[PDB]
Amino acid sequence: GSHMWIGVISLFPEMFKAITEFGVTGRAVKHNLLKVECWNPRDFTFDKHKTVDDRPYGGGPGMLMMVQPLRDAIHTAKAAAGEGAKVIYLSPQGRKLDQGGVTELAQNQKLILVCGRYEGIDERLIQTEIDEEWSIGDYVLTGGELPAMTLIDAVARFIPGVLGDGLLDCPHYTRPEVLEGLTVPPVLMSGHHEEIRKWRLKQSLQRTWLRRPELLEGLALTDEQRKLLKEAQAEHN
Template sequence: MLKIHIITVFPDSFKSYINSSILKNAQKKWIFEPIFYDLGDFSIKKTRRVDDRPYGWFPWAILSIEPLYKAIKSIEEKHPGIRKIYLSPKWKTLKQHKLEKLAKNKKDIILICGHYEWIDSRILEMFEIEEISIWDYILTSWELAAMVLIDWIVRLLPWVINEKSLEEESFSKKLWRKKEYPWYTRPEEFMWFKVPKELLSWDPKIIEKWKNNFNK
């Protein structure tokens, strides 16, 4: 079973998505388990505050180093050498082939969700933390990015989704890491829009040729 340890200021924001559809089924099959750590529980302040003003007279708040350190350390003590990931728009964008390696590894992960503007960068120096970007844009909530990464990884785990479905989808190895072809279902004709005649032929060679035309 893959266990993802999620450090976040807002653990409740995950509940609806994590407990529905594919991810819910993966948990029922004991393939995947999310474990949440409320960063407020590791605060050194009675108010449970986990952020502070950064040095340099910048107008925004960042996550403080003390609760982050305590949260990561509490997990690492039970799981020495566990892989640690911080979602960072500053870093290289994660690609499908790297996700496949990440899922194939099947080793537990600590997923650190930032919030506000950033985190105290010293935490990245203290621990061997891998920075990952889901794309070149900024979100208000790192939790959204974390859910994207969790979905990416879990759907690639064995017995979560039919393997044949994964073999031939956008950015898969079989499609040369390119986008897949269009899909159609019944009815054969809707208003003046028709299903391509190649798909109606039921000839595997014709259909395969049609599919390959989208990967040139």
């Protein structure tokens, strides 16, 4: 119902087939719940070799994205989007993406994602063309395409019809009942939905505490969560 439009600026638009042609996101595109539209800076060049990079002022080992083709591609995308479109640049210098951030971005009906290549883009373009800068993680990649697709996949899950709480997920079990000597926890076989809910919640609480203690600090646990966590920490001791 509340479909989403995402414009993409990229030198390798065919990379985005990975999300538009496969799985849940592929279905979302086919069903017109999500639309991904790509513009290639190479198409906006004029020199006879279609040059899309340029030398950095001050010297340096690498190259930067050439301003004019990239600038023109962005302007074209903005015009196609109309008013309301938020322009986002993916880079390690951006705001750290988390699920809260995903929910925020997902409120936007229109996004334009600029995918950097080489050593990046001109700083003045960030000032004049980019509304927000985001990062998917503290690591370095060869291009902004994978971060853009990661963002798209993340926000797509919030679009109505695409699918079917601060804690890590509980463990999951399926057939067979015994796998290499390891049995399914009896509570999951019991058929008692309330016990199953509490066990799963307790497991999530235990796993978050053991693996990601800092995530617990940012939460105000319910009475039930405080109790189950206490139980888990007592059993762990």
